[PDB]
Design an enzyme around this catalytic site. Structure first.
Site, mmCIF file in Angstrom:
data_model
loop_
_atom_site.group_PDB
_atom_site.id
_atom_site.type_symbol
_atom_site.label_atom_id
_atom_site.label_comp_id
_atom_site.label_asym_id
_atom_site.label_seq_id
_atom_site.Cartn_x
_atom_site.Cartn_y
_atom_site.Cartn_z
ATOM 1 N N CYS A 90 -41.660 17.183 -33.223
ATOM 2 C CA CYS A 90 -42.009 18.320 -34.068
ATOM 3 C C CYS A 90 -40.696 19.070 -34.284
ATOM 4 C CB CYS A 90 -43.006 19.233 -33.372
ATOM 5 S SG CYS A 90 -43.382 20.725 -34.318
ATOM 6 N N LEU A 91 -40.071 18.792 -35.417
ATOM 7 C CA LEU A 91 -38.807 19.400 -35.771
ATOM 8 C C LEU A 91 -38.959 19.799 -37.223
ATOM 9 C CD1 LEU A 91 -35.841 19.861 -34.793
ATOM 10 C CD2 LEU A 91 -35.341 17.535 -35.536
#
Lengths: 156, 156
Positions: B93-94
């Site tokens: 999750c970036l």
């Protein structure tokens, strides 16, 4: 712990060679570590232009010993190569890879030299007597070469 | 067939990105095609310095879609990563990998950004609630982190 000028390590030499290679941009030549392993590269070589190997593509592996560059890497064809100086296992007979090796040579030299060897074999003492013998008939050679190449892809 | 100035192809963009990456020489970052596949890279990232991830090493994969660079690559950890913004499967999750993606970003940006994310998580909506929760105790976090890291290596 004084200064740091002029040093060495196999991983360091391999990095510089991998840079010079990628930066040089030689047509039909590609090489990169197997992935996370810097001591094992997988290369790609397009058959030389103006030869019967034109349009053909070959995959190889280069395994760097613990003595590199003072010892030559083990270069093998993974893609079957019907050639006078190449055996069924993919082992190669190239001067720079044996008695002629010098630590002043790089991977680029090996791959450029090998690419040219395809169209310039040494039929003296062949690893493949059938290819060495047929080299004298370029029309029949091109026919056999492309047959096997296509058949190797279809079969396993 | 007129001129040739300003062109494009995914393989071409990937080559330029692979050059800029290797030439840049960012500490603790390595990335190369899986071997002969240019659309699938295997990367290595050392945990950022001055964080609990220091001395830890992570392997990842970057799979480039047919739309690259106008679509982000799929970046996954192959080495288990206990982190607030990382799941058990290694998915990340970036921001830059999703709604914030811009074709003006390269692989270097992704890897440098991700490396920094290790020490700078976003505990807002965590993929790993246990890590997000424990982030507030850096002493206990470092203990758990290194335990699992060492245990993942020992077990399969």
């Amino acid at each position: 712990m004084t200064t740091s000028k002029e040093r060495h390590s196999v991983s360091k030499r391999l990095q510089q060679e991998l840079r010079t290679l990628l930066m040089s941009g030689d047509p039909g030549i590609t090489a990169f570590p197997d992935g996370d392993n810097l001591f094992k590269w997988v290369a790609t070589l397009d058959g030389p232009k103006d030869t019967v190997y034109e349009s053909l593509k070959y995959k190889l592996t280069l395994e760097f010993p613990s003595d590199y560059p003072y010892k030559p890497p083990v270069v093998k064809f993974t893609t079957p190569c019907w050639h006078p100086n190449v055996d069924q296992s993919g082992n190669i007979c190239l001067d720079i890879l044996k008695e002629n090796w010098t630590a002043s040579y790089d991977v680029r030299t090996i791959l450029l030299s090998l690419q040219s060897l395809l169209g310039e074999p040494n039929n003296a003492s062949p690893l493949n007597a059938q290819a060495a013998d047929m080299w004298s008939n370029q029309t029949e050679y091109k026919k056999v070469l492309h047959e096997k190449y296509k058949t190797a892809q279809s079969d396993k």
